[PDB]
Coordinates of C-alpha atoms in Angstrom, one line a residue:
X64 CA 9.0 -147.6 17.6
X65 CA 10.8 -144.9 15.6
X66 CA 13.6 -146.7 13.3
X67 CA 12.6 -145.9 9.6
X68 CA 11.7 -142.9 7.8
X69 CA 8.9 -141.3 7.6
X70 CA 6.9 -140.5 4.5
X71 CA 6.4 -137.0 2.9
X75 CA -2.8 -138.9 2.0
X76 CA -4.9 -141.8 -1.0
X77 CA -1.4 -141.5 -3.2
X78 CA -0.2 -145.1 -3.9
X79 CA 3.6 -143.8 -3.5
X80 CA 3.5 -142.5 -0.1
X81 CA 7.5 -143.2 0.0
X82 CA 9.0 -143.3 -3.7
X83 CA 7.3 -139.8 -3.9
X84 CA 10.2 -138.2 -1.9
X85 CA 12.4 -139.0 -4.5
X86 CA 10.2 -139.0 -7.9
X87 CA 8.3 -135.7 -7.5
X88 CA 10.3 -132.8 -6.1
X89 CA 12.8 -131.0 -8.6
X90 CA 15.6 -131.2 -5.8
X91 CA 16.0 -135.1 -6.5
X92 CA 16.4 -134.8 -10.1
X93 CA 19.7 -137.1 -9.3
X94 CA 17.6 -139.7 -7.7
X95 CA 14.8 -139.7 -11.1
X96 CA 18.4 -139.6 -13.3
X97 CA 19.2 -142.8 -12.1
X98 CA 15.7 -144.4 -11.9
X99 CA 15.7 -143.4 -15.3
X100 CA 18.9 -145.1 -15.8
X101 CA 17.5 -148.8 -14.4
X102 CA 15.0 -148.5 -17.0
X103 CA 12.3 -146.1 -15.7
X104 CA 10.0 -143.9 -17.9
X105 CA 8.5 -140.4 -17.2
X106 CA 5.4 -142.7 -16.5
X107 CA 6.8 -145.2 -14.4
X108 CA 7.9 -141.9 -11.8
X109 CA 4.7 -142.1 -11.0
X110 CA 3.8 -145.7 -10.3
X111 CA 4.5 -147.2 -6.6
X112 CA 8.2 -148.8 -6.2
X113 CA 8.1 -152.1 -4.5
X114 CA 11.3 -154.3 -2.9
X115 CA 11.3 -157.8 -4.1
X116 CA 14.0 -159.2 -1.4
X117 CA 14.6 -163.0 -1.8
X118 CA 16.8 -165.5 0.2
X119 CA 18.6 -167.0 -2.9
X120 CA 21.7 -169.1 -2.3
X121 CA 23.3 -172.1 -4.1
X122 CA 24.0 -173.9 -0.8
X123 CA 20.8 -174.9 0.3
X124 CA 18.6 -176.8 -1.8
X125 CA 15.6 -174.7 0.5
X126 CA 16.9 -171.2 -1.4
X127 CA 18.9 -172.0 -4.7
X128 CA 15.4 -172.3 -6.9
X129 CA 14.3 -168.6 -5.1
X130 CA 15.4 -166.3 -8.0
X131 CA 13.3 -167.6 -10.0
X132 CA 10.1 -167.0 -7.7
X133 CA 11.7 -163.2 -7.4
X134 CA 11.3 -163.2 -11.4
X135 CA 7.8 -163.8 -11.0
X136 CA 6.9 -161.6 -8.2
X137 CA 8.3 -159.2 -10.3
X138 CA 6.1 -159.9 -13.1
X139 CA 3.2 -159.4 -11.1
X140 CA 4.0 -156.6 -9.7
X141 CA 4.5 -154.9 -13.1
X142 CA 1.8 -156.3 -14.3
X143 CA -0.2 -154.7 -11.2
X144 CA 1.1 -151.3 -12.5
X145 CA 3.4 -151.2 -10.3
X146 CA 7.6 -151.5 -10.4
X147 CA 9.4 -154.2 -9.0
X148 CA 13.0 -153.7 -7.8
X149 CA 14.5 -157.4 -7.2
X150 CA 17.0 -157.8 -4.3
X151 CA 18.3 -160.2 -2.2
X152 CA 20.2 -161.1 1.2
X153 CA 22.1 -163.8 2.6
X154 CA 20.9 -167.0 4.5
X155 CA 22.7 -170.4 6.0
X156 CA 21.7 -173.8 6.0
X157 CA 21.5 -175.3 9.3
X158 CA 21.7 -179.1 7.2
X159 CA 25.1 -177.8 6.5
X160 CA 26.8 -176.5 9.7
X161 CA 24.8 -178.3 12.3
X162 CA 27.6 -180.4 14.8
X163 CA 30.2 -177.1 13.9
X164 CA 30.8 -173.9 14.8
X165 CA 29.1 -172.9 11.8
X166 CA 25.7 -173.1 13.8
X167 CA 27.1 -170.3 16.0
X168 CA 26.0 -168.0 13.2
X169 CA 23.1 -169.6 12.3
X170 CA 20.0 -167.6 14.7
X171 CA 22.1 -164.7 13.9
X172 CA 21.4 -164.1 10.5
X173 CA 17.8 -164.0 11.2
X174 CA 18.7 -160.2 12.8
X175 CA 20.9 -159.7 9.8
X176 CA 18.4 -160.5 7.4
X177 CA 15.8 -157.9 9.1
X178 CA 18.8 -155.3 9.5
X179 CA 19.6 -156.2 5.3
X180 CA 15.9 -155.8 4.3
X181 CA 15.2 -152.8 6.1
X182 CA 18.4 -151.0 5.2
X183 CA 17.4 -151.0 1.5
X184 CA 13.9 -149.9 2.0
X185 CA 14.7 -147.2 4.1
X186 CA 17.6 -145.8 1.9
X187 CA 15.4 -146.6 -1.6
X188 CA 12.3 -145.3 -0.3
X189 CA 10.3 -148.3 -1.5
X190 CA 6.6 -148.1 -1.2
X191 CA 6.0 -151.9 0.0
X192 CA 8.0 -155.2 0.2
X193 CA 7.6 -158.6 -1.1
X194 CA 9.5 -160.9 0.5
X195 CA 10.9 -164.2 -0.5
X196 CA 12.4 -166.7 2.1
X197 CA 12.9 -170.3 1.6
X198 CA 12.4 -173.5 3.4
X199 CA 15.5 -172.6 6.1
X200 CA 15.0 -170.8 9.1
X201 CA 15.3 -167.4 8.8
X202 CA 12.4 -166.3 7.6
X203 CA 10.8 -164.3 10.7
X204 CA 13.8 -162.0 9.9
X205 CA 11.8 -160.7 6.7
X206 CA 8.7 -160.3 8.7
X207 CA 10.7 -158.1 11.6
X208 CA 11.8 -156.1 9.0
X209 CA 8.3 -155.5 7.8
X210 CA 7.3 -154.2 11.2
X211 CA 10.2 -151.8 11.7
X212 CA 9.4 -150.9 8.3
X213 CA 5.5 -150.3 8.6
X214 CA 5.1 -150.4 5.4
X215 CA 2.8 -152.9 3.3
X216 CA 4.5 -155.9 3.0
X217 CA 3.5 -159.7 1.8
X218 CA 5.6 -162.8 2.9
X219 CA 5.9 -165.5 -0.3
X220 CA 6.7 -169.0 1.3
X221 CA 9.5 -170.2 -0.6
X222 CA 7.5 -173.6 0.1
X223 CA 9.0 -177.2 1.6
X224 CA 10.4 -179.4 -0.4
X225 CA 8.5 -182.5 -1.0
X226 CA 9.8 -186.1 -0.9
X271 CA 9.4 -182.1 5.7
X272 CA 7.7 -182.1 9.2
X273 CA 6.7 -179.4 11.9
X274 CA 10.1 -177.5 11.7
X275 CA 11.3 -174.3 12.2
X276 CA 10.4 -173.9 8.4
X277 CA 6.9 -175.4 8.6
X278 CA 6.5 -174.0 11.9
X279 CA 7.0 -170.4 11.1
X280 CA 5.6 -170.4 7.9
X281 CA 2.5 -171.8 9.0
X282 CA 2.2 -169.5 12.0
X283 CA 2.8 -166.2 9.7
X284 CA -0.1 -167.4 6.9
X285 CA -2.1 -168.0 10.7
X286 CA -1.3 -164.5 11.5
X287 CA -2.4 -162.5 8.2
X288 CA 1.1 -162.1 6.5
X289 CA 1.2 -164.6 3.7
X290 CA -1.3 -165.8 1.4
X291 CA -3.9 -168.5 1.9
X292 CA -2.3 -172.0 0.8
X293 CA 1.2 -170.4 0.5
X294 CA 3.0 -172.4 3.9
X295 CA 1.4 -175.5 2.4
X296 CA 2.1 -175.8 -1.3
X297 CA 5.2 -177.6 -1.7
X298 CA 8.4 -175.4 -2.9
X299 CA 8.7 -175.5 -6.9
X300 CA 5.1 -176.4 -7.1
X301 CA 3.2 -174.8 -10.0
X302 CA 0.9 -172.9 -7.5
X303 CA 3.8 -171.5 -6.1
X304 CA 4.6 -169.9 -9.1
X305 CA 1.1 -168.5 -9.6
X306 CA 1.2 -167.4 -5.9
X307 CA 4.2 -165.3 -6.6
X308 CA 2.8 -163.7 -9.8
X309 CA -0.7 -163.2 -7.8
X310 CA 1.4 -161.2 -5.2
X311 CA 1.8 -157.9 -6.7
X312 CA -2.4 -157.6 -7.3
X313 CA -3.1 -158.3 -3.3
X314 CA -0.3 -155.6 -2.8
X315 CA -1.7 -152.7 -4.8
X316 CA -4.7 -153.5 -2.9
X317 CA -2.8 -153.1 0.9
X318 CA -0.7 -149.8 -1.1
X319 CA -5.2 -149.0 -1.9
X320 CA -6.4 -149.7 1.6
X321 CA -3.0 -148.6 3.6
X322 CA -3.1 -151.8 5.2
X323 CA 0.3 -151.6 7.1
X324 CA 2.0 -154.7 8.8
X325 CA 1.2 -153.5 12.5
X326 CA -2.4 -153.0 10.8
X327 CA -2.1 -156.7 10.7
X328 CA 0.4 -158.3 13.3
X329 CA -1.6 -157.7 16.4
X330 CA -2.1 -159.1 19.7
X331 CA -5.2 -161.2 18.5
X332 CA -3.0 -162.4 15.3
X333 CA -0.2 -163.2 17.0
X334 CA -2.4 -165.5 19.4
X335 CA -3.5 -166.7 16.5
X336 CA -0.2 -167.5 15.0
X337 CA 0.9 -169.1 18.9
X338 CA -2.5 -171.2 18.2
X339 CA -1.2 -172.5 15.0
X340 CA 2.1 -173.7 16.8
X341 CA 0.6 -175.6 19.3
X342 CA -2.0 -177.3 17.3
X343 CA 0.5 -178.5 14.8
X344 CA 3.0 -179.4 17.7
X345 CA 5.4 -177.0 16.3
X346 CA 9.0 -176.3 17.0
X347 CA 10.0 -174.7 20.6
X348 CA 12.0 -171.9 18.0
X349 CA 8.9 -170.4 17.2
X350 CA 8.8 -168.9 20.8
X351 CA 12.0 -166.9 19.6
X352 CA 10.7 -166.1 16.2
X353 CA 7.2 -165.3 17.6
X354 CA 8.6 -162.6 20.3
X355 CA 11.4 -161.1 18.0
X356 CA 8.1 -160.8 15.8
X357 CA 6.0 -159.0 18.3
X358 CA 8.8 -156.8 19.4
X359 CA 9.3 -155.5 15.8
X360 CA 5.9 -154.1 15.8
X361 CA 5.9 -152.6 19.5
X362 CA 3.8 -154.8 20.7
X363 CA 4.9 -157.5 24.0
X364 CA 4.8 -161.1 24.0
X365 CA 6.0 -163.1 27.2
X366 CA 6.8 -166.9 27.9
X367 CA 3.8 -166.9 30.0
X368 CA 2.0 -166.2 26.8
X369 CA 2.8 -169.4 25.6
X370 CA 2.2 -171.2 28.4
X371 CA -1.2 -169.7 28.8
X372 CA -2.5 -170.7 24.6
X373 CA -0.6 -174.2 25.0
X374 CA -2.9 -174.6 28.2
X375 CA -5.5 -173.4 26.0
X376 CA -5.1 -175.1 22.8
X377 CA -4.4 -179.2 22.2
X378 CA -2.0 -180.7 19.8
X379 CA -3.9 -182.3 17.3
X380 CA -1.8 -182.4 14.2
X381 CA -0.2 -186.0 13.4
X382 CA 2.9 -184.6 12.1
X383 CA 6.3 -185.2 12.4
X384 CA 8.8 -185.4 14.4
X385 CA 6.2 -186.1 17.0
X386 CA 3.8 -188.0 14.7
X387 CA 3.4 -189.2 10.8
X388 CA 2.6 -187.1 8.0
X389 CA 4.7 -183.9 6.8
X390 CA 3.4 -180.4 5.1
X391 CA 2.9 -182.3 1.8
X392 CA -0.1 -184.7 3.7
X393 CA -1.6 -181.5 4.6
X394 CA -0.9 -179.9 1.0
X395 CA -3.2 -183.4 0.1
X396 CA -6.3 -182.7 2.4
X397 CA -6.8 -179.1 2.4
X398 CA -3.8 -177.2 3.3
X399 CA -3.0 -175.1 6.1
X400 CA -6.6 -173.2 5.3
X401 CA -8.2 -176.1 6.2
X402 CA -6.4 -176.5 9.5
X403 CA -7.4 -172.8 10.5
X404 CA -10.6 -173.7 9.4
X405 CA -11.0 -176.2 11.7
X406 CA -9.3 -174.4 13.9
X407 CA -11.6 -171.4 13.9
X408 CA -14.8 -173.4 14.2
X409 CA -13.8 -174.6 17.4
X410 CA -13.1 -171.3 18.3
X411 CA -9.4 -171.5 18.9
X412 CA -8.6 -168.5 16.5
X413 CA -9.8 -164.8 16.1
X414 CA -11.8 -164.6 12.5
X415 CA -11.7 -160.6 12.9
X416 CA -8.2 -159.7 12.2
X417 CA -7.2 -158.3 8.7
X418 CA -4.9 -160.3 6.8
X419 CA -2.8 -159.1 3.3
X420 CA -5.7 -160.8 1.1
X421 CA -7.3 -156.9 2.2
X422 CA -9.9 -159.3 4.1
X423 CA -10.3 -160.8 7.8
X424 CA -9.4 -164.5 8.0
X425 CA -12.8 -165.3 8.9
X426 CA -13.4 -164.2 5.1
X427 CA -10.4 -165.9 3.7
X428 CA -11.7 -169.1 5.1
X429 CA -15.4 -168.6 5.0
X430 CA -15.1 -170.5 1.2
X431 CA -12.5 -172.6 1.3
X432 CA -12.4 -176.5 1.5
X433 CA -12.5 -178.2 4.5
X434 CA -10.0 -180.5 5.6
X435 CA -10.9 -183.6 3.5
X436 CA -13.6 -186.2 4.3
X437 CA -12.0 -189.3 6.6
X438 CA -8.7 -187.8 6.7
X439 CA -6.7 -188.7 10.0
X440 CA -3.7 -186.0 10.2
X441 CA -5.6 -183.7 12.1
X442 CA -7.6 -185.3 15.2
X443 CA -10.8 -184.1 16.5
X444 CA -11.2 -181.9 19.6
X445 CA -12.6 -185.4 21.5
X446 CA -9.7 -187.3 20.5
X447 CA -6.9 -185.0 20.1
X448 CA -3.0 -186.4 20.1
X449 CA -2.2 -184.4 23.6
X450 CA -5.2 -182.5 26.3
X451 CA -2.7 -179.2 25.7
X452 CA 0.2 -178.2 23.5
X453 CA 3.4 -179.5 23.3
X454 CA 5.2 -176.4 24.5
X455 CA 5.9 -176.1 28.0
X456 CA 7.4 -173.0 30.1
X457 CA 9.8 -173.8 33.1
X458 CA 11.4 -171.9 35.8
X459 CA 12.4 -173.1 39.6
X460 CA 15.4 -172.3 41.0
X461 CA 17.9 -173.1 37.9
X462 CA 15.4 -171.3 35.3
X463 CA 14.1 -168.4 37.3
X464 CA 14.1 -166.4 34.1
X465 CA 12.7 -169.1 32.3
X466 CA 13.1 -171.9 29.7
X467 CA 11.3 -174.3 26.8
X468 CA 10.6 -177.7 26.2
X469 CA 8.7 -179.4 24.0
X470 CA 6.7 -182.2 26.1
X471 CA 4.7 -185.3 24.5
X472 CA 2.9 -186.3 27.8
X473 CA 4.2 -189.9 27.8
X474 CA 7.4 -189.0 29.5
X475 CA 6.1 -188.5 33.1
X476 CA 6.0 -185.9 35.4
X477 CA 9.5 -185.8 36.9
X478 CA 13.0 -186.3 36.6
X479 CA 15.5 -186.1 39.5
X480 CA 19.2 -187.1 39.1
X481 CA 22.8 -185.8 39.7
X482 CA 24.1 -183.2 37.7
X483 CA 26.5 -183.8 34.5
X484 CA 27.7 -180.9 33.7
X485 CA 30.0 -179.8 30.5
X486 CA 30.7 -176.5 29.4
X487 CA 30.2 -177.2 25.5
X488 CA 29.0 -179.8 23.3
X489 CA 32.2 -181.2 22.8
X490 CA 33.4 -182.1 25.9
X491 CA 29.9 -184.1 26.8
X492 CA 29.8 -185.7 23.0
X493 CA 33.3 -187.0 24.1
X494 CA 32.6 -188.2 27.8
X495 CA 29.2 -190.1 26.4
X496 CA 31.6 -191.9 24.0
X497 CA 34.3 -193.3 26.3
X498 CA 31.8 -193.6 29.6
X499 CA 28.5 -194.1 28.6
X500 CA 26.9 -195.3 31.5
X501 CA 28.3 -192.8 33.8
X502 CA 25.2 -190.9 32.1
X503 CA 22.8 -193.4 33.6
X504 CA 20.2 -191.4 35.8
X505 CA 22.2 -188.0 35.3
X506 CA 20.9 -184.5 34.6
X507 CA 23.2 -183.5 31.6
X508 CA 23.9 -180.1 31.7
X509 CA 25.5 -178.3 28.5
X510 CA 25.6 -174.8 29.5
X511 CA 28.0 -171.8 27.8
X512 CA 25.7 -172.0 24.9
X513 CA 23.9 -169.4 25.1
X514 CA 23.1 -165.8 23.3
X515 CA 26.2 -164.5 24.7
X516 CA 28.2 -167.5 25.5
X517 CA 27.8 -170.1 22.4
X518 CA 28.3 -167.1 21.1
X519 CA 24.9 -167.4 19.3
X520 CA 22.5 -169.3 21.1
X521 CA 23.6 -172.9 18.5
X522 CA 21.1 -175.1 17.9
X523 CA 22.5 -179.3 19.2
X524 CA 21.3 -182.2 17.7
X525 CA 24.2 -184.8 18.6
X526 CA 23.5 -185.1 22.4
X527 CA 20.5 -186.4 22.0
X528 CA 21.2 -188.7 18.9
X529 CA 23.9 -189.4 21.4
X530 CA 22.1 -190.2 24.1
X531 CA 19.8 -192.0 22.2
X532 CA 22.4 -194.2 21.0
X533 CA 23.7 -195.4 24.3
X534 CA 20.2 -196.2 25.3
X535 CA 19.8 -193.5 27.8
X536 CA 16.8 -192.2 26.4
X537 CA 14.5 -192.0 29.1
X538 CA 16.9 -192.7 31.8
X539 CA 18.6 -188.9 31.8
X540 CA 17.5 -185.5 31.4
X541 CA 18.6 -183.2 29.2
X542 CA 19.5 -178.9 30.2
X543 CA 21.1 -176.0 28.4
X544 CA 21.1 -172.4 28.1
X545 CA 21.3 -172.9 23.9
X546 CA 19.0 -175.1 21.7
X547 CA 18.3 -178.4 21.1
X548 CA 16.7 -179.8 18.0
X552 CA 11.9 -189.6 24.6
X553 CA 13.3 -188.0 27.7
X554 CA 13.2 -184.6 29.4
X555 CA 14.7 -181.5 27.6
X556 CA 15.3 -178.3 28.2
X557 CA 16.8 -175.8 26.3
X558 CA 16.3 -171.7 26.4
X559 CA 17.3 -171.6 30.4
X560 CA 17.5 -168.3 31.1
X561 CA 20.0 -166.4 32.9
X562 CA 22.1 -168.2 30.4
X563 CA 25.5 -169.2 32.0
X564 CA 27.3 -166.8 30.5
X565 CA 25.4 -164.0 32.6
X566 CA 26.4 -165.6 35.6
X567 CA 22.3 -166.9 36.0
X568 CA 22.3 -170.5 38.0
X569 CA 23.2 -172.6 35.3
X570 CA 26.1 -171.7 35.4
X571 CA 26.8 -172.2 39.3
X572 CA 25.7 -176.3 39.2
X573 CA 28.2 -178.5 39.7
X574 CA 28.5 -182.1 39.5
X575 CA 26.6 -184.3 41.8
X576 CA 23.7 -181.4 42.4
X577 CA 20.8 -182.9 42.8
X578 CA 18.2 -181.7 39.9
X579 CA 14.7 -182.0 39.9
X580 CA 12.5 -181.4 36.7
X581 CA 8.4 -181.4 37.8
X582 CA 6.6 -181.0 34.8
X583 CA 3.5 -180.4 37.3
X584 CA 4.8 -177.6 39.4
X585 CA 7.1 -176.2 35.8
X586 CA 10.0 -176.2 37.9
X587 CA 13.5 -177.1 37.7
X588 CA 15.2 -177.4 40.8
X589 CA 18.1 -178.2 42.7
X590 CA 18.8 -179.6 46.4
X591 CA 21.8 -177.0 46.9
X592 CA 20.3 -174.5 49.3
X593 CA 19.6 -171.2 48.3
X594 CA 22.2 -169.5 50.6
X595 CA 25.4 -172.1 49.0
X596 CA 24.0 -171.1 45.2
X597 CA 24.4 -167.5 46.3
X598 CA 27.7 -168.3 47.6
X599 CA 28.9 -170.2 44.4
X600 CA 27.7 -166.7 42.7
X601 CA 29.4 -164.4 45.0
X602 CA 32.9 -166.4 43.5
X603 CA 31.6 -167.0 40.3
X604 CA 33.7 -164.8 37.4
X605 CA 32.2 -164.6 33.8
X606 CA 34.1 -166.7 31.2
X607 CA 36.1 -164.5 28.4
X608 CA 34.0 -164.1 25.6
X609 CA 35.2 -167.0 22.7
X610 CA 35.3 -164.4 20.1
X611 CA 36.9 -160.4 19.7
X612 CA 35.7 -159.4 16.3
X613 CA 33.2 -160.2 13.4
X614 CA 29.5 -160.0 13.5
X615 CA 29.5 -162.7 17.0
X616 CA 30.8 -160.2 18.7
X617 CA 28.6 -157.8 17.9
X618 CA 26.1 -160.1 18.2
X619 CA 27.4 -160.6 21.9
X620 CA 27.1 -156.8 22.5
X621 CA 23.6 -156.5 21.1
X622 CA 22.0 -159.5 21.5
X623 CA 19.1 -159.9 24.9
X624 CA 18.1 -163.2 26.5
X625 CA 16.3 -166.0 25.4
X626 CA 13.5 -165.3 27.2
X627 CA 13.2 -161.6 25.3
X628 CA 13.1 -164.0 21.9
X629 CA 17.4 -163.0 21.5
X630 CA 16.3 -159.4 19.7
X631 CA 19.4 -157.0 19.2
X632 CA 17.8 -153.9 18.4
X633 CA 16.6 -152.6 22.0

């Protein structure tokens, strides 16, 4: 990985030294001394604050004030904070709209934002500051292009809040060494989270102390570690995408069959919703998510070796604290657990061959077979499902042009399913697309999306589909020979955009399968 500069050793300011101590940067110490810098403070280390404050999500509006406090700390550390901050979205808001086309998007924005100022500032480390929405692996991809010492501060969910994309990625980042103990289960506005974000500057001097770098940290054992987390708390199929984009940021490979191979390895035990009935603030109650690694470490699920940014292994971060509290029943035993293996469930077959994600209970069966549906957005199958409902009855829906490339933006559905739902069709059609979905079979993440001309996008209406959970296939009855035919006519759609930062995103952006990163 070479992105990010390089510094000019035991000093504490192995960056802000190329612009504090030589006389040919006396321009660069003029204007530090302009933001309120003494002669003294030159020679202190220079740390990024960068929060995800915005006023429309009730996830991110209370965030400056957490900055304020990081900030504190980090002064009070004898160090100097420099506050900034990026944009977010709220999915809450856009989700049904186009709105959501921009939505995974700003996850690679956020990591481009972050690690633009650090680079051209020559900050020393980073504390970061994302709230309860979704795009908080974005500050930890900028940490690994970055290298540098860097803490993530959980913003913290809001309390009345389930296994998420919010709960799921901040739990899997405090299971892989990059926040604080306690900090992806103390609920948002909570006065521990306060004291967390004052606390943060004192663990930092001690990474700036040991050099303790974020690819010191985020390493193939952690990020099994973090893959453990998701599949014991049944976490969201959009941590696959967050965990690869993560391990790509650091050099380091992670592959769908990864996942497949820890959720073989590793049984959902968390009774948390969606799937079950407690939220973040149950587990806040009976230990926090220190417990759950805890628990999880004794049964040998996780790696107590790796490093973490306390300075110490998470063996030693754990050795101490509570266990998850006597007669509690949100996290099963390993005798009795809520599925034999996780949740998350890899796919391929002759529709997939690149690959796909579901999220599978168990109590759904092992196959599907049925006709293909197919529509070539969300609209036009939320309209058909409205004025023929049962022409769904025993069909494969198929909502493909959603994609990476083709959404543009890979959007994230909700309505078919409520949809389906509400016509009674739960279990009595499948479910496909090459985007995201948030009792039946579905599929989202299939890969060629249509857009790149893979399969998907050559079914048409009555193909027979078969999903076998068993085998991990989805297949169809067209022979191989009349797909390959229906490819050598097929033409790729124009793109739905020209400008703007989709279609740059359309340029940049890889497949699902290679967790959507835009940088390679």
């Amino acid at each position: 990985v070479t992105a990010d500069p390089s510094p000019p050793t035991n000093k504490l300011n192995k960056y802000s030294s190329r612009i504090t101590e030589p006389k040919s940067q006396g321009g660069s110490q003029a204007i530090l001394h302009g933001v309120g810098l003494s002669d003294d403070d030159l020679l202190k280390p220079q740390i990024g604050i960068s929060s995800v404050w915005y006023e429309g999500n009730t996830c991110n509006m209370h965030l400056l004030k957490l900055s304020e406090a990081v900030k504190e700390g980090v002064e009070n550390a004898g160090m100097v904070g420099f506050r900034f901050n990026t944009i977010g979205v709220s999915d809450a808001i856009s989700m049904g709209t186009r709105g959501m086309c921009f939505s995974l998007q700003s996850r690679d924005l956020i990591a481009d934002s972050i690690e633009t100022v650090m680079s051209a500032q020559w900050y020393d480390g980073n504390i970061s500051i994302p709230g309860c929405d979704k795009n908080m692996p974005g500050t930890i991809m900028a940490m690994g292009r970055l290298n540098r010492p860097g803490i993530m501060v959980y913003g913290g969910t809001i309390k009345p809040g389930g296994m998420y994309t919010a709960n799921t990625m901040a739990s899997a980042i405090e299971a892989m060494g990059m926040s604080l103990p306690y900090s992806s289960s103390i609920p948002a506005e909570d006065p521990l989270k306060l004291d967390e974000c004052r606390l943060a500057g004192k663990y930092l001097l001690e990474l700036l102390k040991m050099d303790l770098k974020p690819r010191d940290i985020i390493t193939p054992k952690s990020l099994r570690n973090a893959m453990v987390s998701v599949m014991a708390l049944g976490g969201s199929t959009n941590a696959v995408l967050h965990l690869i984009a993560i391990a790509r940021s650091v050099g380091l490979e992670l592959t769908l069959d990864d996942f497949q191979k820890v959720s073989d390895a590793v049984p959902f035990l968390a009774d948390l919703k969606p799937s079950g009935k407690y939220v973040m603030e149950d587990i806040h109650k009976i230990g926090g998510t220190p417990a759950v690694l805890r628990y999880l470490l004794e049964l040998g699920l996780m790696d107590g070796d790796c490093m973490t940014v306390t300075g110490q292994t998470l063996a030693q971060n754990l050795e101490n604290v509570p266990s998850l509290t006597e007669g509690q029943e949100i996290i099963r035993p390993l005798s009795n657990p809520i599925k034999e293996t996780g949740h998350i469930q890899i796919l391929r077959g002759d529709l997939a061959p690149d690959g796909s994600v579901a999220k599978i209970t168990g109590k759904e069966g092992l196959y599907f077979s049925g006709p293909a549906l197919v529509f070539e957005g969300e609209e036009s199958m939320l309209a058909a499902i409205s004025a023929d409902p049962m022409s769904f009855k025993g069909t494969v829906v198929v909502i493909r042009g959603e994609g990476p490339k083709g959404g543009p933006g890979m959007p994230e559905m909700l309505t078919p399913t409520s949809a389906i739902m509400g016509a009674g069709l739960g279990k009595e059609c499948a479910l496909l697309t090459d985007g995201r979905f948030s009792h039946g079979f579905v599929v989202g993440h299939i890969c060629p999306e249509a857009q790149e001309g893979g399969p998907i996008g050559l079914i048409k209406n009555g193909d027979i589909i078969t999903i076998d959970i068993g085998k991990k296939r989805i297949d169809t009855q067209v022979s191989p020979e009349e797909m390959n035919d229906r490819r050598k006519k097929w033409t790729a759609p124009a793109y739905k955009v020209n400008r703007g930062v989709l279609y740059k995103y359309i340029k940049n952006v890889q497949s699902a399968s290679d967790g959507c990163v835009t940088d390679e």
